[PDB]
Symmetry: C2
Subunit: 263 residues, 2 copies
Amino acid sequence: GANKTVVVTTILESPYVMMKKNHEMLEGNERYEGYCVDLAAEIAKHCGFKYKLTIVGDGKYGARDADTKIWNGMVGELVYGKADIAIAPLTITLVREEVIDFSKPFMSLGISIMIKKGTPIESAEDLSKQTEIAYGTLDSGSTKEFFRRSKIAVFDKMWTYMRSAEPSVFVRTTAEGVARVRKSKGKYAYLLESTMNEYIEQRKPCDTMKVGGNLDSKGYGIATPKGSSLGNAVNLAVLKLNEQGLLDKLKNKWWYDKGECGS
Amino acid sequence: GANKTVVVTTILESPYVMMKKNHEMLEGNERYEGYCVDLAAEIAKHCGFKYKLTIVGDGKYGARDADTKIWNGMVGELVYGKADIAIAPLTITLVREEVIDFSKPFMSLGISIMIKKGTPIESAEDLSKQTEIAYGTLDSGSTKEFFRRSKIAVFDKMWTYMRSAEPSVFVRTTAEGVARVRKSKGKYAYLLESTMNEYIEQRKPCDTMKVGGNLDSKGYGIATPKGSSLGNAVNLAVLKLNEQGLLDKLKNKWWYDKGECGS
Ligand SMILES: N[C@@H](CCC(=O)O)C(=O)O
Ligand SMILES: N[C@@H](CCC(=O)O)C(=O)O
Ligand SMILES: [Br-]
Ligand SMILES: [Br-]
Ligand SMILES: [Br-]
Ligand SMILES: [Br-]
Ligand SMILES: [Br-]
Ligand SMILES: [Br-]
């Protein structure tokens, strides 16, 4: 059949996808900017397709409801045919690989700890051994599932705390978690992916920092519906852009060239 | 058809695959030990197959001869049907992805610089701006191809030097490169993957070190012949073992628990 505009699902997450300053006066894909906006343009060019960026309807990454078995977020939009490809900071996980296809990773990351500067915390073990400082995760993503499923002693203890903590320690968006770190003044630490942590560390008011090593090691992938013909070309495009140094260029562009906390 | 023993191609590369001390008195898979030996056992268990470890015939990772178009190394053994799966520190690259299938990565790495302690070199740019210190790569792997294909200014200059340097700066095995660093006493630096660099840094005589950041970012994958039915199960196995923390355990086992240069 004739070529057709590719529906891209993505998510408003800085610096991956952000509304341009003058977005109210702009239309279509020009409303948005960021790492994944640049990446979408490069993938489309190499694969030779036109595309339309759309923000995932429920603003979620993707989880399977245990009772109804329904997928939400960007994963759901792929599973149920509402989008042709997801170009976002979407983590490659076993449960997702079973229902959608993933390119080889375009970015590496791991779960990490964000603290308000001066917080007496250096590690996940530190967090698990105390109760003065609360901590939590994004409410429906791969980080929360990591703790839910972990059988590692320290991470198991953290999950037991987080799942029952009052008031809730989970947040609906990364921005809410950052905000809670900043205004709790050392009494909340946020568990999030090192990429987003490192980005926020370079943003004013420059009052947070990443502490300790990463808790795990994983990657983001471009996702397509299982068996989609688009998957092969997209995977080769990712590998080409990585070897060309383009992915490194985009990381430096959106994380550090634009750093607001000094050189 | 009935189940059949899976032929695994791998390569003698420390600490991935090594001859056991008493290998002369042992048979079959028991002759070998290392990260990839443990990994092979875990993958086979989760996928439910028996296997036989074999060392790649020509001792090479894999490259395509430009004139004959013939693949050598572990890639060739997969392409031409001599092995069913490769379980080794085999880098995922575009040219290889076109001819074989790769799991999602089981280990991350990047090209890195190894120096004799005290060598006045901190970066690839440092190397490219001088001639007193020679430098080279493994003779037929992904690192050499990286420099051959790079259009980045600094890496292009390094390749122009290395490809024409006299005497040859390329080595047949990692051990030869390490040996040349050690006995050139600061007048040779070796370009190799950060994983192998980090391992050697923890081995006696503790006279080398990794300097600077990595030049790129990539991963190792389990490789199967293109379209092989084994690929899907192996990929899910890799993802499961990563999320279980097994891959991290194996890295610590073979790199740092066994470190010989202190704590
Ligand atoms: N990248 C994650 C969302 C962020 C997080 O869970 O920390 C996902 O794909 O679910
Ligand atoms: N891992 C590399 C070999 C080592 C190197 O090139 O430095 C490959 O798969 O070709
Ligand atoms: Br997940
Ligand atoms: Br991955
Ligand atoms: Br580029
Ligand atoms: Br290659
Ligand atoms: Br990769
Ligand atoms: Br385990």
